[PDB]
Design a protein around this nucleic acid. Structure first.
Ligand code: MG
Ligand code: ZN
Ligand code: ZN
Ligand code: ZN
Length: 1190
DNA sequence: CGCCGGGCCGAGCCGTGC
DNA sequence: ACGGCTCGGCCCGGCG
């Protein structure tokens, strides 16, 4: 099957996993933990995950056989049929069968990763249609966690419910009119009062969906809002049901296309209404003039991304505005999943608001992306303070030049993958001319004329190179270098002109200016001025003349300097003269034929059209497609802490104080009463919250207590009683309210682990599980000593933004070649042996690259683990690391904030950014998209030792973010569907570029460009992926966003406004103000409204009063009453709002709203805070009184 | 020997027509 | 849309 390398890779991964698991088992066998074994099983494929998560036992082989024979959907259907009939045992009532079938089928369709089956589906019940016919139907109860499962999981849940109800011989739901009205008002209310819904269904759509769904979509209450249509039959609540209405809105409705596709593939009938809903929902001119008109007609600008701007977050471009982001088709080494490629120069020159990993809301392909440094694409063109125009394609040049920048003429490039267009089904935009298109035209012309075969981006035969060099009269070494790396090696301008003359191809894109950004009449005036009042120095090369310098006076140039700047032409101004130097003089004069032919403006023509019609050297439109973007959600590489930081899962109650400090309570002699689980030693009879008896070191047993009665029964005796009190008729509980003395426990712990000098030790106010089993205090002491925190399930986690990578260089990650050869890497991505640090190596599917903050924190985590192994269990240490570079070769676990299964990865290097680099398969296996998402990482051994299922909260949602199972191998066939559209080609073919001009759809050329989906099944899924664009460094550029270094809101707004003013294609002056004023006005008006209807609270307690007490003091205290909405929380943004109103031109509506808001704020407090203080001077240049007096 | 004042910590809160 | 913004109390250093 697999070759002799990937199998060995997986074998070594399994070997390391076994090495860790043996130590974890040996440590756990001693009985100092809630269980006597590890509580994280390891799986290998989807069937094992499904069996471990939902069951039933023995289903793995059946799932494997059915998916092998028919396919995923048909296998799920056969599994449903087999469960219903009774292959997998006897469950009981039909409700059990229905619930099990729904859960298992949803797990199979969902690949058993996200916890929608586990926690989304609260319960399954059979109800009766009493009001209509007294029939029997099925209802699905949706909890809170289903609200974060995605659109696809909910629609498939409805489909599975329908299939199971049809297979169980049950009738359909027949709602009354009151049900419909209740659902419409609920949909209307939730959007108004809770959340934007990310989608707004029309009322008629809601009526149609309610009338044509054979099951009842219901649930419990999740919002504290009352409804109007009350006491509806069959509905047991009078409040908003967020789970069901979100399922209806974002499930069968928003994802109707995928649902009908699944219906077609699945052989399911009875859903014709959804299909119908989907079907209903679904002269003499120039070449470029027509192209522009057609492009504007078919593809229209999208404004949905820039509808809102938050203060401090800049807007970088207007929709489809020239001068914004230049669209380039390709995929870099560390981009392609959903991320963009950006030059570091345009990161530096926008005031460092953009850092590696900073998210931005995009317009054309999708909505949202993450930026990654690419050093082969072009950077911004800027205008300096003295008048010079410069091209900043470098990072150091930008750092040197930043302080002199007056205006940013052009913003730069953005590399967007073809798979991003395929996934979102976005019509192809016309392609800007670039070096990769030029090299293909070059080789094609060479073959057509001289019959010589050459290919770019590879190595060619010496005979062909010699023949081509002889025919072109060039140096063979130069030809080899330029064919090997067209994106970095460019010919001189004279050589490019010679190539265009001989072969007959357009000019090299590097020497083409933005000729279509100006009008033909402006070029006419500029041509006249150049002919009349200019002096030019000419040259010669192979019989070809080219300009070497242009000198024209400023007074003679006039207002054509703006035309020069709009072409992106670099020049300089000295003592009244504007000078154009050597490389950029022929870039301006050669297209105009060296002034040999007159330039004249013509209607229905463009500048490039006239140039091509008259000149002999041909040109292509260098910039025609532009993109809009807006900043949002800066990158993150921080560790995870609870809302109050916690270091041990031990309840303290109120003895610890406001910070729940256990040590402070222990040192003050306080006694505390809390609910915990007490364990009792069978031999001597010790009692307390400890798993081991200190006197004899023999494992105790949990005590079960009656709720009303107060009899304690050990576990062995309670087993016989069926966990019910014999003298009573009430079920037992493992916990009760008891009193504890922290002094003895903390002294015993300190003596146990020999850790005495710890100042603070924070716990919890109370436990959330149903067991209320506490944690040993020794672990808390060791965590406090090493400065690490804990999570809800007993693990230490680190959150970071995720970015993709497929190929790497040993110098970027700081690892020697010998170390890599020890890890297993022996070749580079071209088959050559690995002997250098500048060679490009291909990443294995489960190898990850950490940041340096992550390494710094994992050093402390490893030290804590070693201390735990040496002091608590008495076993040899494992990591033995003194620096972060010593963690290389060790394993981690990657977990997503919405799933319940993890995946094993390996550490191979570190970077100096704030992102998490890994393979696209690694991010897809966690159901992540990599366009702003964040995930957690933890060391494998720490999770193995520390995780427990008895610390998980008992409510719905306590099983999300839990490593209930971990995958030990990667299979691209069952990771995701968005990663199946990614490109694996070295370069795009000429046909793609020729078809972009026809505005085709990406589906028409799926077979032309190879994707991931074209390799599934064959052994070469992990073997030969490739990339299009190259980058010098993977972590070059700014590392932290400026937004995190600004304190005041006024400072944030001012900096964002200077940024918007610098960029030519933003138009801040009014647009950014009006859009920004819809972020401060909501705050002002909402705070003003909530002030007059607010609740008061005691400082000593947390009890809240809906009405202020008449005495002014807490009735059950002496403490004083404080507000929940202060007066200063209303007028905190009024100064910035007034500044925004006065310094810019907004519509009169917003100005009057601001003035009236200030007047209302003044008038509301008339009798409470009268104006009793005068002032020396009046009229502080305020605008409200000026408007009133006008 | 008795204050003044900082610097942490922990609470709460963020458009809406009858 | 949610981290950013107001309050209140509680020790800990100087400092005279
Ligand atoms: Mg996403
Ligand atoms: Zn004992
Ligand atoms: Zn009892
Ligand atoms: Zn009180």
């Amino acid at each position: 099957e697999l070759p002799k390398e990937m199998e060995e890779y997986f074998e070594m991964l399994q070997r390391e996993i076994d090495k860790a698991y043996e130590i974890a088992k040996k440590a756990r066998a001693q009985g100092k933990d809630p269980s006597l074994d590890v509580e994280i099983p390891q799986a290998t494929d989807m069937a094992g995950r499904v069996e471990s998560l939902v069951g039933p036992p023995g289903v793995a082989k059946r799932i494997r056989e059915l998916v092998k024979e028919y396919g995923k959907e048909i296998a799920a259907l056969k599994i449903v049929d087999e469960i219903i009939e009774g292959k997998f045992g006897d469950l009981g009532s039909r409700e059990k069968y229905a619930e099990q079938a729904v859960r298992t089928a949803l797990a199979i369709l969902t690949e058993g990763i996200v916890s929608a089956p586990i926690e989304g589906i609260a319960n399954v019940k059979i109800k009766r249609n009493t009001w209509a016919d007294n029939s029997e139907y099925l209802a699905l109860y949706y909890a809170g966690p289903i609200r974060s499962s995605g659109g696809t999981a909910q629609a498939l849940s409805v489909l599975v419910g329908d299939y199971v109800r049809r297979k169980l011989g049950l009738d359909r739901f027949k709602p009354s009119e009151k049900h419909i009205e209740r659902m419409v008002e609920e949909v209307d209310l939730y959007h108004r009062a809770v959340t934007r819904l990310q989608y707004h269904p029309s009322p008629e759509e809601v009526r149609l969906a309610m009338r044509n769904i054979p099951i009842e979509i219901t649930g419990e209450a999740t919002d504290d809002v009352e409804v109007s249509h009350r006491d509806v039959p069959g509905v047991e609540t009078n409040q908003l049901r967020g789970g069901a209405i979100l399922v209806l809105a974002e499930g069968v409705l928003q994802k109707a296309k995928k649902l009908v596709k699944y219906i077609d593939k699945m052989g399911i009938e009875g859903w014709e209404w959804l299909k119908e809903f989907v079907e209903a929902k679904e002269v003499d001119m120039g070449f470029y003039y027509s192209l522009y008109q057609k492009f504007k007609e078919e593809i229209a600008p999208s404004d949905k991304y820039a509808k809102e701007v938050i203060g401090g977050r800049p807007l970088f471009s207007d929709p489809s505005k020239p001068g914004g982001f230049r669209l380039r088709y390709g995929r870099s080494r560390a981009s392609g999943f959903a991320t963009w490629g950006i030059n570091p120069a345009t990161m530096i020159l926008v005031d460092e608001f953009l850092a590696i990993g900073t998210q931005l809301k995009t317009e054309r392909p999708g909505k949202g992306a993450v930026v990654t440094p690419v050093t082969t694409i072009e950077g911004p063109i800027v205008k300096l303070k003295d008048g010079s125009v410069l091209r900043v394609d470098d990072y150091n040049l930008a750092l040197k030049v930043r302080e002199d920048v007056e205006e940013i003429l052009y913003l730069g490039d953005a590399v967007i993958a073809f798979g991003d267009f395929v996934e979102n089904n976005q019509t192809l935009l016309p392609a800007n001319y670039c070096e990769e298109w030029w090299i293909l035209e070059f080789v094609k012309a060479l073959k057509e004329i001289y019959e010589v075969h050459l290919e770019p981006f590879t190595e060619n035969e010496e005979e062909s190179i010699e023949e081509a060099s002889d025919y072109l009269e060039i140096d063979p070494e130069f030809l080899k270098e330029m064919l090997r790396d067209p994106l970095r090696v460019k010919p001189p301008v004279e050589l490019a002109i010679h190539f265009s003359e001989v072969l007959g191809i357009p000019l090299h894109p590097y020497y083409t200016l933005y000729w279509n950004s100006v009008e033909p009449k402006d070029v006419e005036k500029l041509w006249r001025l150049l002919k009349n009042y200019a002096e030019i120095e000419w040259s010669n090369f192979r019989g070809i003349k080219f300009a070497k310098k242009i000198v024209i006076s400023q007074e003679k140039l006039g207002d054509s300097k703006r035309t020069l700047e709009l072409l992106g032409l670099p020049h300089t101004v000295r003592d009244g003269n504007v000078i154009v130097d050597y490389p950029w003089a022929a870039a301006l004069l050669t297209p105009l034929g060296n002034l040999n032919w007159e330039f004249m403006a013509k209607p229905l023509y463009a500048t490039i059209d006239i140039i091509n019609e008259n000149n002999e050297i041909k040109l292509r439109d260098r910039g025609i497609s532009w993109i809009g973007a807006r900043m949002g959600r800066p990158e993150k590489a921080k560790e995870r802490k609870m809302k109050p930081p916690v270091q041990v899962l031990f309840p303290i109650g109120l003895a610890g104080g406001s910070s729940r400090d256990i040590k402070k309570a222990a040192e003050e002699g306080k006694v505390a009463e809390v609910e915990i689980a007490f364990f009792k030693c069978p031999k001597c009879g010790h009692v307390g919250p400890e798993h081991l008896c200190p006197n004899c070191g023999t494992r105790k047993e949990l005590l079960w207590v009656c709720p009303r009665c107060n009899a304690e029964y050990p576990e062995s005796q309670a087993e016989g009683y069926n966990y019910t009190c014999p003298k009573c008729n009430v079920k037992l509980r493992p916990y009760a309210k008891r009193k504890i003395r922290p002094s003895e426990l903390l002294n015993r712990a300190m003596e146990n682990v020999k850790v005495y000098g710890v100042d603070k030790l924070k716990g919890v106010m109370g436990m959330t599980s149903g067991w209320k089993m506490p944690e040993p205090l020794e672990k808390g002491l060791l965590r406090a000593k090493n400065d690490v925190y804990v999570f809800k399930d007993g693990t230490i986690r680190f959150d970071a933004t995720d970015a993709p990578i497929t190929h790497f260089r040993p110098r970027e990650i700081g690892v020697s070649v010998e170390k890599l050869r020890e890890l297993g890497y022996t070749h580079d991505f071209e088959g050559k042996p690995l002997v250098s640090e500048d060679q490009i190596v291909e990443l294995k599917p489960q190898d990850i690259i950490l940041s340096k903050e992550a390494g710094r924190y994992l050093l402390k985590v490893a030290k804590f683990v070693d201390d735990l192994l040496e002091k608590f269990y008495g076993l040899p240490r494992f990591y033995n690391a003194e620096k972060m570079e010593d963690l290389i070769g060790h394993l981690v676990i990657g977990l997503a904030p919405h799933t319940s299964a993890g995946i094993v990865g390996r550490i191979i290097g570190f970077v100096d950014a704030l992102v998490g680099y890994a393979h696209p398969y690694f991010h897809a296996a966690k159901r992540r998209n990599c366009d702003g998402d964040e995930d957690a990482v933890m060391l494998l051994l720490d999770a193995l030792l520390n995780f427990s299922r008895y610390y998980l909260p008992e409510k719905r949602g306590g099983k999300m973010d839990a490593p209930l199972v971990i995958t030990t191998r990667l299979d691209p066939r069952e990771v995701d569907s968005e990663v199946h559209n990614m490109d694996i080609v070295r370069y795009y073919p000429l046909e793609f570029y020729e078809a972009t001009y026809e505005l085709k759809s990406p589906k028409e050329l799926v077979g032309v460009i190879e994707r991931v989906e074209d390799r599934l099944g064959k052994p070469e899924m992990y073997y030969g992926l490739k990339f299009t664009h190259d980058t010098d460094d993977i972590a070059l550029g700014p590392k932290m966003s400026l937004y995190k270094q600004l304190g005041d809101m006024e400072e944030k707004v001012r900096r964002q406004l200077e940024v918007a003013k610098r960029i030519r294609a933003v138009d801040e002056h009014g647009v950014a103000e009006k859009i920004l004023n819809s972020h401060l006005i909501p705050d002002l008006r909402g705070n003003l409204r909530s002030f007059t209807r607010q609740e008061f609270r005691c400082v000593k307690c947390n009890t809240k009063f809906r009405r202020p007490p008449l005495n002014g003091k807490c009735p059950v205290c002496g403490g004083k009453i404080v507000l929940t909405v202060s007066k200063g929380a209303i007028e905190k943004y009024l100064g910035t709002a007034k500044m925004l109103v006065t310094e810019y031109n907004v519509k009169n509506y917003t100005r009057q709203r601001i003035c009236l808001t200030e007047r209302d704020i003044d008038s509301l407090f008339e009798n409470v805070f009268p104006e009793t203080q005068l002032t020396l001077i009046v009229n502080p240049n305020d605008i409200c009184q000026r408007l009133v007096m006008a």
